[PDB]
């Protein structure tokens, strides 16, 4: 019944199999179910977001984004509270894998990623972008506060979350939204409110699959 704060600890303890694991909030006894990727780039990855089929509704409240929703087996959002707790304890990298509808793949990697507390609206902090999914960060820098349909913290006179759909670190509104509307195979182009990552696929292109994952920077 041993506790692990993340998938790197799950891995280090000898659990090197991909699947769902029970994680423990730091300095707490509260638990959360995350999916662990033990293969990709050496393993130890905690998935904080996954899109793949459009089965889960991402137009959720501040509370649902703070706590988490969906299934760790399929589409889900881990939870802002847990990720902010985890990422403030030690330095994590953020890896983002993307799939278009034409059979291609690309990724973005950040040397440092963390979320501020709920008081600071879970504002994103990102450094050192590498990868094949753009040479400029699709998440706007410096990081914006997080915004939901019931929480306008963007830099837009509009409500980015209501216009683009889902919770995200919208700017005005910024070059990304992996939490936007899922569009199928022939309805994925010229969609302002889709699953967007501008510096890879450009304007209004809605992605087929997305995965956001974290691992301590000192792993390996």
């Amino acid at each position, epitope marked *: 019944q041993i506790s692990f704060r993340d998938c790197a600890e799950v891995f280090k303890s000898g659990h090197t199999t991909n699947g769902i694991y029970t994680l423990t909030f730091p300095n707490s006894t509260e638990e959360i179910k995350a999916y662990c990727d033990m293969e990709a780039g050496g393993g130890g990855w905690t998935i904080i977001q996954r899109r793949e089929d459009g089965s889960v509704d991402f137009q959720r409240t501040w509370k649902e984004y703070k706590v988490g929703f969906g299934n760790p087996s399929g589409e889900y959002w881990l939870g802002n509270e847990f990720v902010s707790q985890l990422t403030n304890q030690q330095r994590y990298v953020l890896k983002i894998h993307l799939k278009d509808w034409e059979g291609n793949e690309a990724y973005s990697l950040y040397e440092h990623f963390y979320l501020s507390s709920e008081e600071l609206n879970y504002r994103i902090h990102l450094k050192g972008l590498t990868g094949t999914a753009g040479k400029i960060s699709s998440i706007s820098q410096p990081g914006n506060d997080f915004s939901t349909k019931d929480g306008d913290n963007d830099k837009c*006179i*509009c409500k980015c979350s209501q216009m683009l759909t889902g919770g995200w670190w919208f700017d*005005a*509104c910024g070059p990304s939204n992996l939490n936007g509307m899922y569009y199928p195979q022939r309805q994925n182009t010229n969609k302002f409110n889709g699953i967007k990552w501008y510096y890879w696929k450009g304007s209004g292109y809605s992605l087929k699959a997305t995965t956001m994952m974290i691992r301590p920077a000192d792993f390996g």
Partner: antibody
Amino acid sequence: EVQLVESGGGLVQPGGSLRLSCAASGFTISDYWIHWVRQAPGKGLEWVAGITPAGGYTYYADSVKGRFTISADTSKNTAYLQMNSLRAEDTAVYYCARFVFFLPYAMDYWGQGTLVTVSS
Amino acid sequence: DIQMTQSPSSLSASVGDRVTITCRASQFLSSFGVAWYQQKPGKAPKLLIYGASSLYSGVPSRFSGSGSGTDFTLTISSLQPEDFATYYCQQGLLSPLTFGQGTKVEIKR
């Protein structure tokens, strides 16, 4: 038919004040944003101020901040531009416009414009 | 405070010519927030193109728009004599909502 009718223009002396009105018809101002735009003689179009009547959130161009107040009365279905400490370069045709905040997300209807002259 | 740099400041072209006006934003803009307006002398501005590339109702299809990010374009594919006017881009996303400096279109005859 959607219409915006501005009134309250005319001649004022520098340092003087003037209130412009924007009377909406064919729509409810709380379902939109109301923005004021102006055009000074021989100059380009200039965005002045904007109001979200559902909330009262206001936005201003730096050129008018501290001197102009944009407001709205949802009962009268009318928006206003209170212009104080007027300067010579405030002389312009002032237009109010309906800003649609859902798609098309732009100013689809405009008033006819009201001339404001700031001179002694 | 986003800057909208419009070019050219003025242009002169013949009836039937294809004309393109460019607008450069100082920061990334969501394409849905970019609009083009036409203003004839002594008339109120008229919406031409909304959301960077959508033609507004009542606007002739010789008017088109394109681009994303920081680079937006207004095209008049067959310049008509009535197209004499100043054209403006605007971003309605980040306050203050300052317009481009405008492009004065003159008809060469």
